Design a protein around this ligand. Sequence first.
Ligand SMILES: O=C(N[C@H]1c2ccccc2C[C@H]1O)[C@H](OCc1ccccc1)[C@H](O)[C@@H](O)[C@@H](OCc1ccccc1)C(=O)N[C@H]1c2ccccc2C[C@H]1O
Lengths: 99, 99
Amino acid sequence: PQITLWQRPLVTIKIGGQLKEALLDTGADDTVLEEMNLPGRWKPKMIGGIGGFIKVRQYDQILIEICGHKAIGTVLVGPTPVNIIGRNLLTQIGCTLNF
Amino acid sequence: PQITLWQRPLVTIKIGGQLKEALLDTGADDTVLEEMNLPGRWKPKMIGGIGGFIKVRQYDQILIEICGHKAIGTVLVGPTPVNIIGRNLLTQIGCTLNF
Ligand SMILES: O=C(N[C@H]1c2ccccc2C[C@H]1O)[C@H](OCc1ccccc1)[C@H](O)[C@@H](O)[C@@H](OCc1ccccc1)C(=O)N[C@H]1c2ccccc2C[C@H]1O
């Protein structure tokens, strides 16, 4: 599909059987979701954006479904204000920026 | 032009006769640039990101060239980690997300 940017580019994602809303963020290197439970072991990590840094938990090889497209990659979980789908997963679904 | 996301979507922008590098960010509602000098009066604004809020200066009707495409709009200036081209200007150059 082609997403215009008059409004925030929010889409529905499926992860861990749960359905959620998330923002397609080309400015985010990684993907970070609000506090939730995921399987496997995790690694602590600090990520910084506008405003400073936050502590998140890193999970690897997590399967996410974005608008029907399956994608695999690292998923961070932490006190983020909104769910964010970063570049690490946007590339997997063939997402691009077009002027 | 089509831009993949395997790397940060960095482009060159021209503002105040100067060349700068900035990030095309669909996750940013507004455009914020690192500390610099702009003409006219400014208004105060608070923007919230991943790690909290920051205070920025708001300038209106600023001319800015993004990859050869001229745009005129609101530009914010403050302690941002990188120069950011947000949705307010991305829509002016007809930028869309595609997959
Ligand atoms: O933090 C970032 N990346 C980092 C990131 C994110 C997730 C995981 C890892 C990493 C590392 C780094 O790439 C990106 O910034 C550039 C950036 C790049 C590199 C280093 C630092 C910053 C994001 O795309 C932010 O732009 C955007 O974040 C999503 C968000 C939307 C709405 C509300 C709260 C948060 C955000 O903060 N948006 C707000 C904003 C921004 C500018 C002007 C106005 C407004 C209002 C609101 O829309």
